């Protein structure tokens, strides 16, 4: 929201400077995004009045005869150019913002143009450029440099939060600076109205849409360009001056956050009817756009006999037809409070966001209408010399705000401050609140323009910001947390110790988007994503990852393409989405592997990834193992399910080659599990001092048999004193059955209280060999 320093200074005279202002506002809850200097006008540009405008035969240009002090001629192509207005004359020699080429005397078309009159774009005061600036013919003595009446200005780009809609009016902010102690100057709306009756009527057919609605009557209007200070102020605020009357509705809309529209009576007919639009009703809106209405759209219409026609779009924009122009002498003034949601709906329904729509959507003072009318009207009488009727057409009586209970002690208690009661009330009262009651709990009724003030806390936030957030001391609380909060951190911590262990084991951590390309559900042989986006960022991020590894693999690729890493080992922990949200952990290995760099050999591949895995659990104190399992995305044979201590979670294996190749990628090794991992609470156990019983043993079993069942059996029959069981070797083997293999098993035994008697050793050994292949 643009804030012209000098304009606001009109309501807050004792303002220090734009900088102190930015300061004061930041503290009140308004952040300045930018500050700017704006109306630089050379001595070259002066005020001139068009005495005559003669068009040049055979051309679309006019020769303008100007009174600039001494008479002078310029040639203009601008359409609004005509006798009877004041203009901005850039004399020859003037340097203008736009043209790096200096203004000069050019012979245009049989006529020598002494300089040129300017459009807002050219003078630099505005974006327009499609026509000359138009001034009251008598604004200044012909010749006086414009700068004299048009000084540069400073404009703050402010940020008005949705809770401060009253702030969309400069007067709204001025009421705050006032709360801080500044003097406040409310414009006095002087008005000389007449007793006469109003030449039209008002019918509010949809009161749900237009809760409060008023009409004013002004006639005997002399429509002309707005005085300079107003054109200045409006241009400064980012709006473009049209004519005194229109300009007034905009000025006031910016002053109080109350949009309003002046309708030429010529088009009203018998009266104004506020009603929903009839299906397929047409309206050529102000912007010159022809539009078709929807029946939900609240509209401002007129009627003649049995004719009902749309004049403008309620709260959003006025019709092109009824809009005020030079030839207007009487109008009806719309000043209302519309229903935000309808406006919102209607507004975004067509491609529109206007000064008015914006404010109506955010909220308008439910009782600002009538005072608003007195202001605009008074202004009208002054700038357009309007005759104003003393009566208004009013519709819908809105109810005032209620008293809010307020305890000064509570305020201090909540902020942790100690402001004296008196200081507090003084503040609320400065903000326009009524404070009744003797204490300790008071009856505080907020002004109606304050829609954000409903609860006692809203009231406290107030004493706070006015006194200043910086005035709240620093403290630290101390208390024994309620019991049920005791263990809380466990899970989080668990995950972190894990995350940490990995990076320490040698895994580079990675962060992957939680999105998924529905297409990969195919590319990677896996079921489809159970959750999809209604507003995907891209059709390639339209689903929610069901698996983590696809992403890792995908990362693998792009890395290869950017930098060429020989090997890579990494992991990632993230939330995948299936029936329920789940925390998964996957890791990917690739490359030559580990070993001597220079020295030839490497040791890598699947059994390397497993190596690490086993170590990791070894470190976590969890007993893990793998068993071959068929996995759609995993090359078989090299596929396997994972068994954390006693359980099935995730998988591990080599990436199925088919996919390996569908992607410019060589071989990759993976694994993906579900967290949290289960945990085995340690049961400490005394180790015995009596030396163990050592053994040499091998097993010959079919080439297909899985190491698993093997170890399993041997183990389950070893007996209760088997301290260790390892595998030092195996090979298929020439010296034995074509379809069987050999197994080097080192064995150890121990008895806690005493040493193991050989009687029990070569005895139990058999206990195994027996049911060993007895099976």
């Amino acid at each position: 929201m643009r804030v012209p320093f000098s304009w606001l200074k009109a309501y807050v005279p004792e303002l220090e400077s734009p900088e102190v202002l930015e300061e004061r506002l930041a503290g009140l809850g308004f952040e300045t995004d930018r500050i700017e200097r704006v109306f630089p006008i050379p001595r070259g540009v002066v005020f001139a009045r068009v005495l005559e405008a003669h068009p040049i035969p055979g051309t679309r240009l006019k020769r303008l005869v100007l009174d600039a002090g001494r008479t002078v001629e310029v040639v203009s192509g601008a359409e609004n150019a005509r006798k009877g207005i004041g203009v901005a004359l850039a004399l020859p020699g003037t340097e203008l913002p736009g043209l790096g080429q200096k203004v000069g005397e050019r012979v245009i078309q049989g006529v020598r143009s002494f300089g040129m009159a300017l459009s807002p774009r050219e003078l630099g005061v505005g974006e327009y450029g499609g026509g000359l600036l138009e001034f009251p013919e008598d604004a200044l003595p012909p010749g006086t440099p414009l700068s004299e009446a048009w000084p540069e200005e400073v404009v703050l780009d402010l940020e008005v939060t949705p809770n401060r809609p009253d702030a969309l009016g400069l007067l709204g902010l001025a009421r705050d600076l006032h709360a801080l102690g500044y003097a406040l100057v409310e414009p006095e709306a002087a008005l000389k109205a007449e007793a006469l009756p109003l030449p039209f009527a008002l019918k509010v057919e949809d009161p749900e849409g237009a809760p409060h609605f008023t009409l004013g009557y002004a006639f005997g209007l002399r429509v002309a360009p707005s005085p300079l200070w107003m054109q200045r102020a409006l241009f400064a605020a980012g709006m473009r001056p049209i004519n005194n009357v229109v300009d007034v509705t905009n000025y006031v809309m910016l002053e109080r956050a109350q949009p309003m529209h002046a309708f030429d009576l010529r088009f009203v007919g018998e009266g104004i009817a506020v009603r929903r639009a009839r299906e397929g009703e047409r309206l050529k809106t102000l912007d010159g756009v022809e539009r078709t209405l929807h029946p939900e759209d609240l509209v401002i219409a007129g009627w003649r006999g049995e004719e009902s026609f749309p004049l403008g779009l309620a709260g959003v924009m006025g019709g092109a037809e009824s809009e005020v122009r030079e030839d207007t002498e009487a109008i009806a003034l719309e000043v209302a409070c519309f229903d935000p949601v309808s406006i919102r709906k209607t507004a975004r329904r067509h491609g529109l966001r206007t000064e008015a729509s914006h404010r109506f959507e955010r909220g308008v003072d439910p009782l600002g209408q009538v005072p608003a009318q007195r202001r605009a009207l008074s202004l009208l009488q002054a700038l357009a010399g309007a005759r104003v009727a003393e009566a208004l057409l009013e519709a819908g009586s809105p109810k005032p705000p209620e008293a809010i209970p307020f305890r000064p002690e509570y305020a201090n208690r909540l902020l942790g401050t100690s402001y004296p009661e008196a200081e507090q009330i003084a503040i609320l009262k400065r903000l326009g609140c009524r404070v009744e009651g003797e204490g300790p709990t008071y009856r505080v009724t907020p002004p109606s323009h304050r829609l954000d003030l409903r609860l006692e806390e809203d009231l406290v936030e107030e004493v706070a910001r006015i006194q200043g957030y910086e005035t709240i001391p620093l403290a630290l609380p101390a208390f024994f947390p309620a019991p049920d909060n005791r263990g809380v951190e466990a899970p989080y911590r668990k995950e972190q110790r894990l995350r940490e262990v990995l990076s320490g084991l040698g895994f580079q951590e990675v962060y992957t988007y939680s999105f998924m390309d529905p297409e990969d559900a195919r590319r990677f042989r896996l079921d489809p994503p159970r959750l999809l986006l209604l507003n995907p960022l891209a059709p390639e991020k339209a689903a929610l990852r069901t698996h983590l590894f696809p992403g890792l693999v995908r990362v693998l690729k792009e890395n290869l393409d950017l930098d060429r890493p020989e090997r890579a080992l990494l992991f990632e922990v993230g939330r995948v989405f299936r029936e329920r949200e789940e925390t998964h952990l996957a890791g990917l290995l690739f490359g030559e592997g580990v070993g001597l760099p220079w020295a030839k050999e490497r040791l890598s591949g699947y059994f390397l990834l497993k190596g690490y895995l086993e170590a990791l659990f070894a470190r976590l104190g969890l007993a893990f193992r793998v068993e071959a399992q068929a996995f759609p995305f995993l090359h078989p044979g090299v596929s396997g399910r994972v068994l954390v201590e006693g359980e099935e979670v995730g998988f591990l294996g080599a990436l199925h080659p088919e996919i390996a190749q569908e992607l410019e990628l060589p071989p990759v090794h993976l694994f993906e599990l579900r967290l949290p991992l289960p945990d085995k609470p340690l049961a400490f156990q005394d180790p015995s001092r009596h030396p163990a019983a050592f053994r040499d043993l091998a097993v010959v079993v079919p080439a297909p048999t899985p190491y698993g069942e093997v170890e399993a059996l041997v183990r389950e029959a070893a007996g209760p004193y088997l301290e260790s069981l390892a595998l030092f070797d195996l090979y298929q083997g020439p010296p034995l059955p074509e379809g069987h293999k050999s197994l080097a098993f080192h064995l150890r035994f121990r008895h806690p209280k005493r040493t193991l008697r050989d009687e029990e050793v070569e005895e139990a050994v058999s206990r195994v060999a027996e049911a060993l292949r007895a099976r």
Partner: protein, 265 residues
């Protein structure tokens, strides 16, 4: 391929139980805003005994069986990196750090001090010559005993509980009046555990601190502030927690024992 086969024998590391218990105790106090700092194992008779209200020829000096040292060219550093004098020894408890810290800093503050201490007793299953303790000190204006009581209570809750509670009995220590020994309620095993000692820092200790500070040119900082300190046996606790039976087990570098705590976290 046979996937059920063993992978590449990769080394799986572990951490010593004392380190584990240390870490846990620390994380706990860290949450109450305490900061962990360490002292030197070789101390001066001054910081170990003199600084703390402990006399030379009286019954107090006689509660701690000390290890005296000898040797030259050994440089002992003071709180400020200055050389200090005194008969060398092996810190008998961690308390000395109470002083080195207070000399080097300004209140208010909260610190906790883990540390290997040394005592000359005979090694049994509940007593050793080389063990660790954890010292705690909180100094500030307004500090009272209820704070020391609260502190300890939060510790019990954090270790066992909330069905657990704290026991404070008066006891004597030269460096704190009021002194106290404290026990914790172990709801599980169902018995009271004598954990350590604590009390309100003794005036003579604050005195010593400032006196040494001025000797070093620093202004007095502990006039008019209060404080409590405590100290507890770590092995005594690790044992109860991780279910170890012989305190001697800790310094017995046996792997079969050490590895038993691999996944403690």
């Amino acid at each position: 391929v046979d996937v059920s086969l063993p992978g590449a024998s990769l080394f799986s590391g572990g951490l010593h139980p004392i380190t584990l218990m240390e870490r846990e105790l620390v994380e706990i106090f860290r949450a109450l805003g305490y900061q962990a700092v360490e002292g030197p194992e070789v101390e001066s008779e001054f910081f170990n005994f003199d600084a703390l209200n402990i006399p030379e020829h009286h019954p107090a000096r006689d509660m701690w069986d000390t290890f005296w040292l000898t040797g030259e060219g050994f440089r002992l550093e003071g709180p400020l990196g200055e050389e200090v004098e005194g008969r060398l020894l092996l810190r008998t408890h961690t308390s000395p750090m109470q002083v080195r810290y207070m000399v080097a800093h300004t209140p208010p503050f909260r610190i906790v001090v883990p540390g290997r201490v040394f005592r000359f007793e005979q090694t049994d299953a509940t007593h050793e010559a080389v063990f660790h303790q954890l010292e705690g000190l909180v100094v500030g204006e307004g500090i009272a005993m209820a704070h020391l009581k609260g502190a300890i209570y939060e510790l019990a809750q954090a270790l066992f509980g909330p069905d657990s509670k704290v026991r404070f009995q008066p006891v004597y220590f030269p460096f704190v009046e009021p002194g106290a020994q404290f026990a914790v309620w172990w709801p599980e095993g169902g018995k009271w555990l004598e954990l350590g000692g604590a009390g309100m820092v003794h005036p003579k200790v604050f005195q010593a601190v400032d006196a040494y500070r001025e000797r070093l040119g620093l202004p007095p900082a502990y006039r008019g502030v209060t404080g409590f300190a405590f100290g507890l046996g770590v092995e005594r606790l690790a044992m109860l927690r991780y279910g170890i039976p012989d305190i001697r087990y800790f310094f017995g570098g046996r792997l079969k024992f050490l590895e038993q705590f691999k996944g403690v976290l």
